[PDB]
Design a protein around this nucleic acid. Structure first.
Ligand code: NA
Ligand code: NA
Ligand code: NA
Lengths: 62, 63
RNA sequence: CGCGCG
RNA sequence: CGCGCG
Protein backbone atom coordinates (compact mmCIF):
# COMPACT_ATOMS: atom_id res chain seq x y z
CA UNK A 1 0.00 0.00 0.00
CA UNK A 2 1.10 3.56 -0.82
CA UNK A 3 0.39 4.78 2.74
CA UNK A 4 1.96 1.72 4.39
CA UNK A 5 5.19 2.45 2.53
CA UNK A 6 5.18 6.11 3.54
CA UNK A 7 4.70 5.22 7.21
CA UNK A 8 7.28 2.42 7.21
CA UNK A 9 9.79 4.69 5.42
CA UNK A 10 9.23 7.54 7.92
CA UNK A 11 10.00 5.14 10.78
CA UNK A 12 13.06 3.62 9.04
CA UNK A 13 14.44 7.14 8.54
CA UNK A 14 14.52 7.59 12.35
CA UNK A 15 16.86 4.66 12.95
CA UNK A 16 16.48 1.20 14.48
CA UNK A 17 14.24 0.85 17.54
CA UNK A 18 12.85 4.40 17.26
CA UNK A 19 9.16 5.02 17.90
CA UNK A 20 6.62 7.66 16.85
CA UNK A 21 2.93 8.54 17.42
CA UNK A 22 -0.02 8.72 15.01
CA UNK A 23 -0.27 12.40 15.99
CA UNK A 24 3.26 12.97 14.70
CA UNK A 25 2.85 10.84 11.56
CA UNK A 26 -0.35 12.71 10.69
CA UNK A 27 1.42 16.08 10.80
CA UNK A 28 4.65 15.11 9.03
CA UNK A 29 3.02 13.01 6.29
CA UNK A 30 0.10 15.42 5.84
CA UNK A 31 -2.50 12.73 6.40
CA UNK A 32 -5.55 12.70 8.72
CA UNK A 33 -4.81 10.84 11.97
CA UNK A 34 -7.83 8.56 11.44
CA UNK A 35 -6.20 7.24 8.24
CA UNK A 36 -2.75 7.03 9.87
CA UNK A 37 -4.30 4.94 12.67
CA UNK A 38 -6.24 2.65 10.31
CA UNK A 39 -2.91 1.74 8.62
CA UNK A 40 -0.89 1.56 11.88
CA UNK A 41 -3.29 -0.96 13.49
CA UNK A 42 -3.45 -2.98 10.24
CA UNK A 43 0.34 -3.14 9.86
CA UNK A 44 0.58 -4.29 13.48
CA UNK A 45 -1.90 -7.08 12.73
CA UNK A 46 0.30 -8.04 9.77
CA UNK A 47 3.30 -8.05 12.14
CA UNK A 48 5.13 -5.26 10.32
CA UNK A 49 4.81 -2.84 13.26
CA UNK A 50 4.92 -3.10 17.04
CA UNK A 51 2.45 -1.11 19.13
CA UNK A 52 3.60 0.02 22.56
CA UNK A 53 0.21 0.65 24.20
CA UNK A 54 0.13 4.01 25.97
CA UNK A 55 -1.58 7.39 25.88
CA UNK A 56 -0.90 7.94 23.06
CA UNK A 57 0.47 4.59 21.87
CA UNK A 58 3.97 4.48 20.34
CA UNK A 59 4.70 2.63 17.10
CA UNK A 60 7.95 1.11 15.78
CA UNK A 61 9.17 -1.30 13.11
CA UNK A 62 8.45 -4.85 14.32
CA UNK B 1 -31.28 18.52 20.99
CA UNK B 2 -31.50 17.46 24.65
CA UNK B 3 -35.23 18.20 24.99
CA UNK B 4 -36.04 16.09 21.91
CA UNK B 5 -34.28 13.05 23.34
CA UNK B 6 -35.80 13.57 26.82
CA UNK B 7 -39.34 13.70 25.36
CA UNK B 8 -38.83 10.58 23.21
CA UNK B 9 -37.34 8.54 26.06
CA UNK B 10 -40.18 9.83 28.27
CA UNK B 11 -42.84 8.67 25.79
CA UNK B 12 -41.06 5.29 25.56
CA UNK B 13 -42.73 4.45 28.89
CA UNK B 14 -41.92 3.97 32.57
CA UNK B 15 -38.61 2.16 33.19
CA UNK B 16 -38.06 1.69 29.44
CA UNK B 17 -34.67 2.14 27.76
CA UNK B 18 -33.20 2.03 24.24
CA UNK B 19 -29.98 2.43 22.27
CA UNK B 20 -28.33 5.38 20.53
CA UNK B 21 -28.65 3.38 17.31
CA UNK B 22 -32.41 3.19 17.87
CA UNK B 23 -32.76 6.90 18.73
CA UNK B 24 -30.66 7.68 15.65
CA UNK B 25 -33.19 5.92 13.39
CA UNK B 26 -36.29 7.19 15.20
CA UNK B 27 -35.20 10.85 15.28
CA UNK B 28 -33.44 10.88 11.88
CA UNK B 29 -30.20 12.06 13.46
CA UNK B 30 -26.63 10.80 13.04
CA UNK B 31 -25.65 8.47 15.91
CA UNK B 32 -22.55 10.65 16.46
CA UNK B 33 -24.81 13.58 17.41
CA UNK B 34 -27.25 11.38 19.35
CA UNK B 35 -24.40 10.01 21.45
CA UNK B 36 -22.85 13.41 22.18
CA UNK B 37 -26.19 14.56 23.56
CA UNK B 38 -26.85 11.36 25.56
CA UNK B 39 -23.49 11.43 27.34
CA UNK B 40 -23.95 15.12 28.21
CA UNK B 41 -27.47 14.55 29.55
CA UNK B 42 -26.06 11.78 31.81
CA UNK B 43 -23.42 14.18 33.15
CA UNK B 44 -26.33 16.55 33.89
CA UNK B 45 -28.15 13.79 35.85
CA UNK B 46 -31.14 13.77 33.48
CA UNK B 47 -30.49 10.30 32.01
CA UNK B 48 -29.16 7.02 33.29
CA UNK B 49 -26.68 5.07 31.19
CA UNK B 50 -27.09 1.34 31.79
CA UNK B 51 -24.01 -0.87 31.80
CA UNK B 52 -23.42 -3.18 28.85
CA UNK B 53 -23.11 -3.14 25.10
CA UNK B 54 -24.71 -1.39 23.34
CA UNK B 55 -25.39 1.02 26.21
CA UNK B 56 -29.04 1.56 27.16
CA UNK B 57 -30.39 4.98 28.11
CA UNK B 58 -33.43 5.91 30.17
CA UNK B 59 -34.88 8.84 32.13
CA UNK B 60 -33.13 9.19 35.47
CA UNK B 61 -35.03 8.17 38.60
CA UNK B 62 -35.11 11.33 40.68
CA UNK B 63 -35.54 12.40 44.31
C1' C C 1 -8.55 11.10 25.03
C1' G C 2 -6.56 5.15 24.68
C1' C C 3 -10.24 6.29 18.95
C1' G C 4 -8.24 2.39 14.58
C1' C C 5 -14.95 2.28 14.09
C1' G C 6 -16.61 0.96 8.12
C1' C D 1 -17.95 -2.30 18.43
C1' G D 2 -18.32 -0.16 24.02
C1' C D 3 -17.08 5.45 20.17
C1' G D 4 -19.45 10.42 22.84
C1' C D 5 -13.45 12.58 20.69
C1' G D 6 -14.08 18.68 19.79
NA1 NA E 1 -24.52 4.62 23.30
NA1 NA F 1 -16.51 4.42 16.65
NA1 NA G 1 -11.55 9.79 19.11
Amino acid sequence: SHMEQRILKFLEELGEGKATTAHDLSGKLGTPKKEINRVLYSLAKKGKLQKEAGTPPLWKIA
